[PDB]
């Protein structure tokens, strides 16, 4: 049975899309240029990536967007259309595209018992356990979206000035104290803040940012949340992503964990 014939049919594809050429940088700020086409997702990219690069078997590697203007990033969900997303660049940016390794991207799924039981206190699981909690949270009928809430620090619109208030995230998106709602999470991209307690005369350093993608200048339908610690941080992040991407972030691990 001939299946080279399966092989010749892939490079016909790979011949008809049209290419463009990205700059990549590195962990050291080294750069590299590479092909990718427009149908490519972020898992194509880093696999060619790594498949060009030494490369090394890591769970943790990432590409990374800086949004240089607002002085913050976000790395890619691995099932993003890469190009539809450099697009939203201005012509003259100066954002940045790294490759590298980030403990951050999949945190949640090697200990979703910090994450995902609504617990500001970390606690260890049996391997076996995170599997079932894992599947029973992604898998079903529906997302179970945990259950996070607490009071943030919100930026005022246009405003180097802070407020706080008690949010809470469900499905629908981020409301405040019954309810009000905040923000809907489909037509919002989450970032972290760079250094915002200098920039935004923000409490502290541990700064969440959502913005729709399009945006690359100030702008007051960019939204600032600001934690009073990492922690609370990196539970909204994550609560937002299983929020916002939900079984399909559950996918884009296992393939991770696939190239280990």
């Known amino acids: 049975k001939a299946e080279k014939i399966r092989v010749a049919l892939e490079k016909i594809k790979e011949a008809q899309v049209k290419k463009l050429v990205i700059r ?44 240089s203007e607002l002085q913050m990033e976000r790395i890619f969900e691995d099932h993003e259309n890469l190009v539809e997303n450099l697009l939203n660049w201005t012509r003259d940016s100066q954002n940045k595209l790294i490759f590298m390794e980030r403990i ?20 260890e699981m049996a391997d076996r356990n995170k599997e079932v909690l894992l599947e029973e949270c992604f898998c079903g009928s529906s997302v ?17 000035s802070w407020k706080k208030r008690y949010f809470l995230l469900r499905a629908s998106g981020i409301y405040y104290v019954d309810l009000v709602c905040f923000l809907q999470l489909d037509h919002v991209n989450v970032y972290y803040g760079q250094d915002y307690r200098n920039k935004y005369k923000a409490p502290t350093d541990y ?12 702008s ?26 939900g079984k399909q972030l559950y996918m884009n691990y296992q393939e991770a964990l696939k190239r280990t």
């Open 24 to 67: 990549v940088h590195m962990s050291d700020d080294s750069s590299k240029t590479m092909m990718v086409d427009e149908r490519q997702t972020v898992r194509q990219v880093l696999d060619n990536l790594m498949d060009k690069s030494h490369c090394g078997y890591s769970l943790d590697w990432s590409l990374v967007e800086t949004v």
């Open 104 to 123: 951050e991207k999949y945190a949640l799924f090697k200990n979703p018992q910090n994450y995902l039981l609504g617990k500001k206190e970390t606690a």
């Open 144 to 160: 179970t979206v945990p259950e996070i809430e607490g009071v943030l620090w919100l930026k005022d619109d246009g405003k180097k």
């Open 207 to 218: 700064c969440l940012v959502l913005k729709h993608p399009q945006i690359q200048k100030k």
């Open 220 to 245: 007051q339908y960019i939204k600032y949340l600001c934690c009073d610690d990492v922690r609370t941080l990196h539970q909204w992040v994550n609560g937002i992503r299983i929020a916002k991407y």
